DNA sequence: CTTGACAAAAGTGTTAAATTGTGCTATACTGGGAGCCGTCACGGATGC
DNA sequence: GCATCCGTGAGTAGAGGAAGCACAATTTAACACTTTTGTCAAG
């Protein structure tokens, strides 16, 4: 209903309200000390889906190297944007580079460079250049018959990665167990492993390799962004309706015709809930009333058959999506799957 | 504007996984419910409890058990000396590899939903419905068997769909058996139509669905398939008369019989006068008028202190002399 | 008004048979489909 | 000064109008039997 209420309250345009409403854009409830493009992050400050994951999540890509080819780069080597990782693509970001799957591997035995077939259904279970002695495993497979071993002590060498995963991260080498696991998020200064030998140095979410026994952190923060109608109830839970009216009887006095008018628009609307005793929260629903059902009838005609109202399908339609959720939430759903039910359900109440 | 093209884009953004990309996601999947079970055996917890405390720091503190407890359960397994820390490490990781083969896969059901329209529901409808079949999958996979996933997806996600459609797409709910007779039904009368050049008898569908079928089954059965019809339907051209304007309401009475069933009670009330005391209040509570319940012979006879016999004949000398008078004046046959 | 009756109408387990609710299926399959201009004309309110 | 969005347009009457299957849980019906409740005859 235009002007819209809650834009008012809140100082948010009818396009920014309906992409957060309907689940298309981020809006930021606590920075948390981050930085994006070199410029920190604000409160009430819109992100893109590509913008939070980038925040959230990090910078990672993979390049998929033509069969055959061998990958210039080792496992393991920082890179940088441009440099070149294949004969025939380049790296276009600046981080480790990982090997995904070697498909085959070569091993300098003690005595010698055999050479070993890796198969999709055969995964490598040694790092690249480990002594492995004699009766080590090197290579892992379903069947037993076809699974390779060690027959001397040597060094492994992994050739012919089927992709190249560059990943910007900080690398800790450490010995002992380590004091996180992979999902958690860290702050600098804080231990990972070998009883405070190792510390990490950026905020970011943490993964331990085992075959590798390092410690990644993949740099990204701890951001609370949020969408939906949740998201516009904690702002509106938040707001301190003497406060803004002081602020704006202070713009009632600006020169301009404009300024004035405007926050006249603004303090009508302020001033009808501090007088009226409503809650501003109050217009975002968390129970749905339901009309009496004789208002709503479903009744036999005289000859047999069923009459029933328009209502009913509609209530019929929110409770549906209203049970789906809940189930969807108990069986830790995706955040994709999650967020089309709930885009669904504000639909149905509308 | 459109939600439909809204979740393709989203969708979009995941691509398709290659096949040493799906085994080995598959693996670490299975491992990592492997070694769930083992730290609960450790451990002496649930294992439904450890996986939920596994899955929620995965998922982070973006979801809304209370959390005082889930850190402190979280500490429990890092207490755990190395040796059996790596069951821990496992865990987390697999659930991790979950997510993603779960993600890589929604336009394997997109594709199955696209089948389904108009049958009830709306196609995202049909597609949240298919993506829990999804989901299933997961869990059941098994890639030992060589097999690509798929060739076992695809059993899960039709099933959910198929059992959505007869479970929320009707007003009246039909159960699933009796949905399943409907469809065989129809699908016989459809061939027996195109056969015959003309509509078939009850008694040609009857014979043709096998044994346990005459025509009066056949007749009831299409009469439970009937959908209701909606009261805001128009009829006519300009839109200003719909259904519920021809359906008169026959539950509340009307100002008739309202005024009958009071000139009835004032009648009867001085009929009861010319009764003694005890004749007329005898009368009132074995009919009912006073409680608005009959109450039994004994019931009669406790109120008073007499026994049970005595009332069967007071009510019954009452009766007699109701009957004398109302042959007197003729002003209670109306009534009847 | 109180006893002995007397069958009857109603109440109470017990159990077999209809009826209903639920899980499962292993070749491989991976981004929808209907629309489609005598598009109604004019005033008011909002945002640039 | 102008592009974009949104709500408004007389009354009464009529008269037609597309999966299976296996198996566990649950509900219902049938059947006796026990108990309660009127009638009848006294008295």
Redesign the interface.
Same mark, same amino acid.
């Given at each position: 209903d235009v002007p819209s209420k809650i834009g008012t309250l809140l100082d948010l345009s009818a396009t920014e309200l309906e992409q957060v409403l309907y689940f298309?854009k981020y809006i930021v409830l606590d920075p948390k000390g981050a930085i994006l493009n070199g410029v920190p992050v604000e409160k009430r400050q819109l992100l893109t !889906?590509e913008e939070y994951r980038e925040l959230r999540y990090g910078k990672q890509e993979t390049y998929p190297l033509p069969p055959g080819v061998d990958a210039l780069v080792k496992d393991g080597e920082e890179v940088v944007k441009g440099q070149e990782l294949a004969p025939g693509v380049v790296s276009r970001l600046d981080g480790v580079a990982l090997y995904?799957?070697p498909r085959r591997v070569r091993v300098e035995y003690v005595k010698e460079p055999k050479d070993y077939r890796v198969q999709?259904?055969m995964?490598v279970v040694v790092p690249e250049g480990a002594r492995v002695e004699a009766g080590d495993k090197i290579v892992a497979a379903?069947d037993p018959e076809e699974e390779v071993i060690a027959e001397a002590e040597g060094v492994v060498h992994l050739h012919e990665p089927?992709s190249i995963l560059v990943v910007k991260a900080r690398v800790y080498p450490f010995e002992? !167990?380590?004091?996180v696991?992979?999902?958690?998020?860290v702050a600098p200064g804080d231990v990972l492993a070998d009883g405070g030998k190792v510390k990490s140095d950026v905020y970011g979410r943490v993964?331990?390799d085992?075959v590798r026994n390092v410690v990644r952190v993949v740099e990204s923060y !701890?951001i609370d962004a949020?969408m939906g109608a949740e998201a516009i109830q904690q702002l509106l839970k938040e707001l301190d309706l003497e406060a803004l009216e002081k602020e704006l009887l202070e713009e009632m006095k600006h020169p301009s015709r404009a300024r004035r008018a405007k926050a006249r628009k603004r303090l009508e609307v302020v001033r009808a809930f501090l007088d009226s005793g409503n809650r501003p929260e109050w217009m975002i629903l968390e129970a749905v009333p339901v009309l009496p059902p004789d208002l709503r009838?479903?009744?036999q005609?005289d000859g047999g058959?069923?009459?029933?109202?328009?209502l009913? !399908?509609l209530y019929?339609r929110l409770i549906?999506?209203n049970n789906?959720l809940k189930?969807?939430?108990a069986?830790?759903?995706?955040e994709?799957?999650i967020?089309?039910?709930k885009?669904?359900l504000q639909?149905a109440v509308d | 504007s459109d939600?439909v093209r809204?979740?393709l884009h989203?969708?979009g953004? &995941?691509p398709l996984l290659?096949?040493?990309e799906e &085994?080995?996601l598959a693996?670490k999947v299975e491992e990592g419910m492997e070694a769930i079970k083992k730290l609960s055996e450790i451990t002496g917890l649930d294992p439904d409890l450890i996986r939920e405390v596994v899955?929620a720091?995965?998922?982070?503190?973006?979801?809304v058990l209370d959390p005082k407890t889930v850190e402190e359960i979280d500490q429990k397994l890092?207490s755990l000396?190395?040796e059996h820390?790596?069951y821990?490490?496992i865990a987390?990781?697999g659930?991790?590899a979950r997510?993603h083969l779960?993600?890589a896969n929604?336009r394997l059901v997109v594709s199955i939903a696209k089948k389904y329209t108009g049958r009830g529901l709306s196609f995202?409808?049909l597609?949240?419905?298919g993506?829990?079949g999804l989901?299933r999958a997961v869990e059941k996979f098994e890639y030992?068997r060589?097999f690509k996933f798929s060739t076992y997806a695809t059993w899960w996600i039709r099933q959910a769909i198929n059992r959505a459609i007869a479970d929320?797409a009707r007003?009246?709910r039909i159960p699933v058996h009796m949905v399943e007779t409907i469809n065989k039904l129809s699908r016989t009368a459809r061939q027996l139509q195109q056969e015959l050049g003309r509509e078939p008898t009850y008694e040609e569908i009857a014979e043709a669905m096998g044994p346990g079928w005459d025509a009066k089954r056949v007749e009831e059965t299409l009469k439970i398939a009937?959908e209701? &019809?909606?009261?805001?339907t128009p009829i006519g051209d300009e839109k200003d008369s719909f259904?519920?304007d021809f359906?008169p309401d026959e539950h509340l009475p009307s100002p008739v019989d309202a005024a009958t069933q009071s000139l009835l009670s004032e009648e009867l009330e001085k009929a009861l006068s010319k009764l003694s005391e005890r004749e007329a209040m005898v009368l009132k509570l074995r009919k009912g008028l006073i409680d608005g319940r009959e109450h039994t012979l004994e019931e009669v006879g406790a109120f008073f202190g007499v026994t049970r016999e005595r009332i069967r004949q007071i009510e019954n000398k009452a009766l007699r002399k109701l009957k004398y008078h109302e042959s007197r004046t003729r002003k209670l046959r109306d009534f009847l």
């Open positions: 298309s !889906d995904r799957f999709p259904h995964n379903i089927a002992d !167990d380590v004091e696991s992979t999902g958690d998020r993964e331990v085992l !701890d949020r009838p479903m009744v005609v058959r069923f009459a029933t109202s328009d009913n !399908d019929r549906n999506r789906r189930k969807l939430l069986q830790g759903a995706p994709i799957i967020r089309n039910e885009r669904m639909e | 939600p809204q979740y989203e969708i953004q &995941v290659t096949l040493e &085994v080995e693996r899955r720091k995965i998922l982070g503190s973006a979801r890092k000396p190395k820390k790596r821990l490490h987390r990781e659930e991790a997510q779960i993600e929604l995202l409808d597609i949240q419905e993506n829990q989901i030992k060589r929320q007003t009246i009937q209701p &019809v909606s009261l805001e259904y519920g359906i």
